[PDB]
């Protein structure tokens, strides 16, 4: 009854459930939890879908039969859920297959919609320059409006909706690589429920420049057939036709949890997880952060040092706009340094860090993790090594570390389960989780942590 005692308390959450599910070999417990999933809010359980489906694939049949019923139930009341399952089921197996076909079994429109989009990306491969790729993209995207009214949606959107229009003239390709990813803007009409509504009616078709996000919506709205409607909103996704996003997804969950941990405790670090979508385990989509551009390009257009740009874009240090931006900088630095450390990110450079209009930084590329540098340019923005704001940066890191230790298992859980039958490059070591746990230094005293943080920063400065 001691187990059952716990499970019937308020203490029981989806986190706990999966942990016992992953470890417990008692089928009586497994089945009990399988059933208890239904009582939880749809929203809480969703976050763990990548874990659940991985278990289904790679674990004993016993575990699967306990899991399957809940999945099917969700699938029947949400095609979005159905979609994401099918995509995930496939990517993580190269047991799974039997269930995927049953789920794909109506939903036909969406799978072609996605396939077309990648097929586009693969096509840009024969065109060797960035600019050339972009021209073909816009043209070929224009062909999508012909089926544009559609009855399809972006799973990456916070909500249910129909895609109505692609402002093809506004789309752009992001690099010159052979299988370069490309960013597109998409118009949608919000729904209350996708599964229960009409597809909207077509509204017939009748410039592109560098601009902030809210100004870009205005311009597009005024130009859009559907723009007058209150139902109308603009979304955006980046398309990766030949790159795996499974490592990327793993990082996202970790970022989201750390974000919540620091939220529950009262540590004012700042970070920005960006939604990830996995299509094939070769291909994916990303929901982009708006109002941000790489440090490197920021340095090529300005010809300035980072601090000077801050001063240019916000004001003299006697202004609110600057001091606020500075605060936002420092808080975002500590957050991402800890994330880089905890996940042991590597290959950190100004191509992988974005700057938003309020001053936060945002690391964006999470290849090369598991199995961050402080350049003097960064330290300058903080007011220098002796600065109070720089000291505060160190203070936040400690605070955020003390908070993180208090919730270590929530984090490791997310990661430890994904190693399960995994052929990802980040899991090469037997160690890998074991080393990860050591990096929380759970044994250490706070005095020890104060010292370790100082040392970390000094190391981070050598370059």
């Amino acid at each position: 009854s001691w187990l059952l005692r716990l499970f019937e308390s308020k203490l029981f959450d989806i986190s706990m459930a999966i942990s016992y599910l992953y470890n417990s070999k008692e089928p009586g417990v497994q089945a009990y939890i399988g059933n208890r999933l239904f009582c939880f809010r749809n929203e809480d359980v969703d976050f763990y879908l990548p874990q659940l489906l991985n278990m289904y694939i790679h674990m004993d049949e016993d575990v699967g039969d306990a899991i399957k019923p809940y999945i099917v139930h969700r699938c029947r009341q949400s095609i979005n859920f159905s979609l994401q399952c099918a995509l995930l089921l496939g990517a993580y197996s190269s047991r799974g297959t039997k269930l995927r076909k049953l789920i794909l079994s109506r939903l036909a429109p969406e799978r072609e919609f996605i396939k077309s989009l990648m097929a586009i990306g693969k096509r840009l491969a024969t065109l060797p320059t960035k600019e050339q790729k972009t021209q073909r993209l816009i043209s070929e995207l224009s062909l999508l409006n012909h089926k544009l009214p559609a009855r399809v949606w972006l799973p990456t959107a916070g909500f249910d909706h129909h895609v109505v229009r692609v402002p093809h003239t506004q789309a752009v390709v992001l690099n010159s690589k052979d299988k370069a990813p490309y960013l597109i803007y998409v118009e949608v009409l919000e729904c209350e429920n996708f599964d229960t509504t009409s597809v909207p009616a077509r509204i017939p078709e009748n410039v592109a420049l560098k601009e902030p996000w809210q100004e870009k919506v205005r311009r597009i709205r005024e130009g859009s057939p559907y723009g007058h409607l209150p139902n109308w909103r603009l979304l955006s996704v980046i398309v990766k036709c030949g790159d795996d996003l499974r490592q990327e997804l793993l990082a996202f969950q970790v970022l989201k949890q750390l974000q919540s941990i620091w939220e529950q405790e009262r540590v004012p670090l700042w970070i920005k997880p960006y939604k990830i979508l996995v299509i094939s385990a070769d291909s994916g989509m990303i929901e982009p952060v708006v109002n941000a551009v790489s440090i490197h390009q920021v340095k090529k257009q300005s010809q300035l040092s980072l601090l000077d740009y801050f001063l240019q874009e916000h004001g003299s240090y006697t202004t609110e706009a600057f001091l606020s931006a500075q605060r936002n900088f420092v808080q975002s630095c500590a957050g991402y340094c800890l994330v880089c450390y905890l996940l042991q990110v590597k290959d950190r450079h100004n191509g992988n860090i974005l700057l938003d209009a309020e001053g936060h930084i945002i690391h964006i590329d999470f290849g090369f993790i598991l199995s961050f540098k402080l350049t003097t340019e960064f330290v300058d923005v903080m007011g220098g090594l002796d600065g109070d704001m720089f000291n505060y940066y160190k203070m936040l890191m400690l605070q955020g570390l003390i908070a993180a230790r208090k919730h270590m298992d929530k984090v490791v859980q997310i990661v430890e389960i994904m190693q399960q039958g995994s052929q990802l490059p980040c899991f090469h070591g037997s160690s890998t989780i074991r080393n990860l746990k050591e990096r929380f230094h759970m044994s250490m005293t706070e005095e020890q942590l104060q010292l370790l943080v100082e040392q970390m920063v000094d190391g981070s400065m050598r370059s």
Binding site: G28, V29, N35, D65, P69
Partner: protein
Amino acid sequence: YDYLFKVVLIGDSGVGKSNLLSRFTRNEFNLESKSTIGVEFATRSIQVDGKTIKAQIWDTAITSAYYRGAVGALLVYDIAKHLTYENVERWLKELRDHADSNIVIMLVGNKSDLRHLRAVPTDEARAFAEKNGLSFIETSALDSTNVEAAFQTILTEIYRIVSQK
């Protein structure tokens, strides 16, 4: 004091024979499960029509063969695992052969609490249930549902054997 009833619990492994007994005999339950190795009894006395009886329940390495002189049998299956229901036919064939040819039998669907994971409908079971000379309650050992009722059905069922001159 007045009568001694030999009852067996039989069924596939995992169906909940041992937890029914722990609920029914000691009002204790556990999710953690030590397999029953061979045989258990536990005992509890009840009163029917103002008469003191005593039920001796035996839980159950195939050869238990403990049936003999076994007047009643609770045959249990897990409602959430269809296969456990499938072997009920094979559990009634081996019944007759190594066990009394006129024993009182009640069929039991256990783990009724797993509403959303339910894999065996009450009607299909109860259909087979009334099609043949078996009893048919559904229980949950975990949330102490129908557990007393199940026993007291078979015991009352059992009692009505008086067959006097």
